[PDB]
A paper describes a structure:
PUF (for Pumilio and FBF) RNA-binding proteins regulate gene expression post-transcriptionally throughout Eukarya. The signature biochemical activity of all PUF proteins is sequence-specific binding to defined RNA regulatory elements. They do so via an RNA-binding domain (RBD) spanning eight α-helical repeats, called PUF or Pumilio repeats. The FBF RBD can recognize either of two core elements: a longer ‘canonical’ 9-nt FBE with a consensus sequence of 5′-UGURnnAUn-3′ (R=purine)23–26 or a shorter compact 8-nt FBE (cFBE) with the consensus 5′-UGUGAA(A/U)n-3′21,27.
A candidate emerged just three nucleotides downstream of FBEa. Its sequence (5′-CAUGUUGCCAUU-3′) contained key FBE features (boldface): a 5′ UGU, 3′ AU, and an upstream C, and these features are conserved among Caenorhabditids. The candidate sequence deviated from a canonical FBE: a uridine followed the UGU, rather than typical purine, and a second uridine replaced the typical final adenosine. We first determined a 2.2 Å resolution crystal structure of the FBF-2 RBD in complex with an 11-nt RNA carrying FBEa*. Indeed, FBF-2 bound to FBEa* by recognizing the 5′ and 3′ nucleotides common to FBEa and FBEa*: FBF-2 interacts with 5′-CAUGU and CCAU-3′ in both FBEa and FBEa*. The FBF-2 RBD structure changes little (RMSD = 0.37 Å over 2, 744 atoms). The RNA sequences align in the 5′ and 3′ regions, and the side chains that contact the RNA bases in each structure are equivalent and positioned similarly. No electron density was seen for the atypical U4 base of FBEa* (cyan arrow), so U4 is likely flipped away from the RNA-binding surface, as seen with other PUF binding elements with flipped bases. Following the flipped U4 nucleotide, PUF repeat 5 (R5) interacted with G5 of FBEa* in a manner similar to its interaction with G4 of FBEa. We next measured FBF-2 binding affinities to a 14-nt RNA carrying FBEa* using an electrophoretic mobility shift assay (EMSA). Despite equivalent contacts with the two RNAs, FBF-2 RBD bound to FBEa* RNA with a KD = 427 nM, ~6-fold weaker than its previously reported binding to FBEa RNA (KD = 70 nM).
Residue numbers in the entry: 167 to 567
Write the structure that this text describes.
RNA sequence: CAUGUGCCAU
């Protein structure tokens, strides 16, 4: 595959082969897509480069559209393109603006195809990270705004381009991605997907006013807050679909677990989880969300949650004597009951705070623990047959000390 | 029932 003027009598490259010989020969494309040839170029381009060698490298690697696209989508050549891009941005000569402008053009024209390509998406992320801000923002504007943007968010490779944008580009230049994701149909498709949920999760974290965003100005905080409220509105409106989904349940858990998103935790608990705890506790994926709600709900909402379990309506009653008995022995609900019991034991033993709003809720935790202990005592025979039941009994048996 | 799900990609 390599041109014969570069091989040995054994079929390998000559030791005294130089970078200028490859650049002057016009056969760089044959080396860059070859295994051992690309690695020669990888070592060569990181040595000392004369003015003309940079001239030749820039032209042949990032100066021709078809050659640039062909190398960016190659299993080996994509590494060479990333190396030359880095050299081009560290070489502040005359054509520093021409080369970066041309590089923008080559990428913008084939933005969707290279995002979806396993190897060219690496060129996108490297360019977003190292290009000047004003140039990197032009690549962001080149992202599609239709159904192709959904395919990017759910692609195994293209989703990292969106994650890179979120990480290194200011929110002002990718706010349209937030409002695209917050569109209900797009949110449904994206949050039902393995890679799409990580994209939405990364967006939520960046839009959170936590310790990592304290460096923002007031204008950047206001912009971030408005984008957060819009996205949270769509998330909370589809909370039932998301909490029960195999992938989106991690997003609802993150929101409920994050103190810096407390307003949306309480919104999720009321609009979605309340009056549905019994049904959701028997769900494979939503039961994890119910555990998080019990762990992190404010004490006023927690009291309503406890009261819903202890004296809750069972519409269309069949099996189980009450909601507590159903959950106590259900294959998934038993983890919720263990969570309820551990919360109450931690509160009674001074391991969990019982004061909120200035008033102590210890008397309520005492009442909930008394109900659970009374139930576990009367059910001890059947609980002894289950792993969960053994742990519930031991939890109450260890609180005696 | 000694029990119940991910992303982390050349």
């Amino acid at each position: 595959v390599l041109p014969t003027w570069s091989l040995d009598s054994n079929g390998e490259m000559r030791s005294r082969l130089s970078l200028s010989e490859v650049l002057d020969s016009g056969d760089l494309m044959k080396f860059a897509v070859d295994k051992t040839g690309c690695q020669f170029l990888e070592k060569a381009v990181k040595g000392s480069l004369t003015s003309y060698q940079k001239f030749q490298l820039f032209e042949q690697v990032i100066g021709r559209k078809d050659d640039f696209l062909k190398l960016s989508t190659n299993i080996f050549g994509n590494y060479l393109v990333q190396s030359v891009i880095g050299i081009s941005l560290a070489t502040n000569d005359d054509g520093y603006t021409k080369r970066q402008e041309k590089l923008k053009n080559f990428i913008s024209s084939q933005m969707t195809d290279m995002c979806l390509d396993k190897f060219a998406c690496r060129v996108i992320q490297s360019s977003l990270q190292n290009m000047d801000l004003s140039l990197a923002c032009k690549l962001v504007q080149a992202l599609p705004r239709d159904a192709r943007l959904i395919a990017i968010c759910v692609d195994q490779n293209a989703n990292h381009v969106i994650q890179k944008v979120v990480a290194v580009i200011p929110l002002k230049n990718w706010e349209f991605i937030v409002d695209f994701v917050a569109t209900p149909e797009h949110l449904r498709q994206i949050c039902s997907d393995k890679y799409g949920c990580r994209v939405v999760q990364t967006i939520i974290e960046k839009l959170t006013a936590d310790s990592m965003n304290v460096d923002l100005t007031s204008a950047a905080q206001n912009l971030r807050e408005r984008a957060l409220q819009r996205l949270m509105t769509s998330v909370t409106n589809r909370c039932q679909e998301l909490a029960t989904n195999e992938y989106a349940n991690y997003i609802i858990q993150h929101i409920v677990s994050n103190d810096d998103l407390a307003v949306y935790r309480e919104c999720i608990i009321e609009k979605c989880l309340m009056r549905n705890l019994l049904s959701l506790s028997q769900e494979k994926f939503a039961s994890h969300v119910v555990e998080k709600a019990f762990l992190h709900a404010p004490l006023e909402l927690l009291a309503e949650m406890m009261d819903e379990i202890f004296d809750g309506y069972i519409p269309h009653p069949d099996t189980g004597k009450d909601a507590l008995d159903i959950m106590m022995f259900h294959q998934f609900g038993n983890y919720v009951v263990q969570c309820m019991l551990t919360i109450c034991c931690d509160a009674v033993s001074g391991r969990r705070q019982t004061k909120e709003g200035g008033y102590d809720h210890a008397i309520s935790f005492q009442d909930w623990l008394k109900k659970l202990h009374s139930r576990v005592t009367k059910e001890r025979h059947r609980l002894s047959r289950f792993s969960s039941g053994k742990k519930m009994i031991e939890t109450l048996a260890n609180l005696r000390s």
